[PDB]
């Protein structure tokens, strides 16, 4: 609580608010705060990168919208809006006792929402979407005002066990549609059961035409990760990007094109393609060439209990931002194990062959443990009568749930909430 005298002097017309870091009250002002009037120090910018788009299980932000910290926050009443403001921020920039006034005000609107921008010395910036845009670092979409937001429409190619849908749910993003291409019966099954019939399954991605894309109604989000076997370089039998299942990449490339808005249509649109980092060099280049972008590399280890390094091409907001670990996450294989079993390593390795000690004997990971490694809710793939082999394979191919949670989170600022 170190800025009270500085802000006092700010309203005393002796210090410029733009000359102070309104987050921590540092004098080391370098940037301007993208959302409000004032300066920002670099450390708070780092924090802002890790924290801004972190949301709790209630679907509200984990921390204050201003300081990206704060001990007690006020959640926002307006529909589809998820912001919070710590009591402490408010009891400075707005006025003293303004916080309890919002606490007691049953229908309350946050300052990102309220019609006018003055709320004390605190004022909302008019160009803030673009500043936000730059902060996280070309056609770029501004964030949709809270009342206009609608349910997201999703095309998901090579959907696997429907990780996409799961994460969007966990984030509490309202989902209008979720069309998914898949051909593996076990995975389709998992999806069907787990999301209660909601997924429109089409078959082979190669049966999806532009006409289909058009009549399956506008999409807000296209996602997918093609098979990696013929791409992965450690495979002696590789057929490469242009053969085997490698060429399925190009189907993504096709359908993305088909699903994309025409120039002049500025509706928000997002896409995410994933694959293994262990590919050829010309392969990775040709993918980058075709999606006209370069991948970000993300390793699950940062946030899960597996060494899983993956490339992600796409235009999701802030996907370059640093990966943070929410407390829910389970780092260390031990956190993922069943009682009486003990972890050799701290991270499992999938892109000792028996990672577990159980009563002097050397055991493999149990499907439920593997689920836990991968960030999935436990028993998520307990659905049909498919072999243990099959359930392993399914979990083997999938996205790390907390990595995807990280990628999808800022979509909340563009779509509707439950």
């Amino acid at each position: 609580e170190f800025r009270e005298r500085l802000v006092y002097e700010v309203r005393q017309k002796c210090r410029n608010i733009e000359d102070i870091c309104i987050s921590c009250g540092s004098l080391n002002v370098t940037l301007e705060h993208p959302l409000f009037v004032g300066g920002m120090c670099q450390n708070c910018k780092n924090c802002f990168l890790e924290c801004a788009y972190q949301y709790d299980d209630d679907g509200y932000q984990s921390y204050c919208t201003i300081c990206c910290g704060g001990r007690e926050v006020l959640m926002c009443g307006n529909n589809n809006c998820c912001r919070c403001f710590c009591v402490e921020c408010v009891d400075l920039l707005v006025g003293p006792g303004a916080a309890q006034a919002a606490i007691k005000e049953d229908p309350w609107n946050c300052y990102m929402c309220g019609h006018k921008g003055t709320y004390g010395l605190l004022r909302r910036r008019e160009d803030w979407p673009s500043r936000l845009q730059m902060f996280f670092a070309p056609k770029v979409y501004p964030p949709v005002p809270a009342e206009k937001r609608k349910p997201i429409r999703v095309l998901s190619l090579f959907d696997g066990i429907a990780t996409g849908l799961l994460v969007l749910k966990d984030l509490g993003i309202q989902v209008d549609r979720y069309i998914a291409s898949e051909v593996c019966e076990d995975s389709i099954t998992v999806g069907m059961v787990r999301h209660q019939g909601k997924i429109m399954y089409v078959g082979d991605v190669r049966s999806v035409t532009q006409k289909h894309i058009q009549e399956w109604g506008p999409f807000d989000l296209v996602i997918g990760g093609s098979p990696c076997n013929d791409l992965s370089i450690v495979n002696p039998a590789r057929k490469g990007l242009y053969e085997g299942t490698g060429r399925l990449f190009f189907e993504f490339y096709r359908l993305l094109h088909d699903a994309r808005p025409k120039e002049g249509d500025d509706r928000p649109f997002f896409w995410l393609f994933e694959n293994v980092v262990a590919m050829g060099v010309s392969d990775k280049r040709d993918i980058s060439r075709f999606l006209e972008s370069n991948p970000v590399m993300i390793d699950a280890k940062e946030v899960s209990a597996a060494h899983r390094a993956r490339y992600f091409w796409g235009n999701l907001p802030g996907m370059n931002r640093p990966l943070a670990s929410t407390v829910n996450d389970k780092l260390e294989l031990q956190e993922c194990l069943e009682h009486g079993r003990i972890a050799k390593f701290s991270k499992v390795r999938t892109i000792q062959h028996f990672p577990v000690f159980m009563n002097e004997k050397e055991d493999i990971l149990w499907c439920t443990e593997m689920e836990r490694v991968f960030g999935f809710p436990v028993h998520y793939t307990d659905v049909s009568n498919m072999s243990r082999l099959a359930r392993q394979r399914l979990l083997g191919r999938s996205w790390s749930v907390p990595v995807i949670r990280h990628l999808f989170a800022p979509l909340k600022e563009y779509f509707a909430c439950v």
């Binding site: 984990s62 001990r71 959640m75 009443g77």
Partner: peptide, 10 residues
């Protein structure tokens, strides 16, 4: 307005 308490970090 509704109120919650944050989860402390690191």
């Amino acid at each position: 307005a509704r109120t919650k308490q944050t989860a402390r970090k690191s």
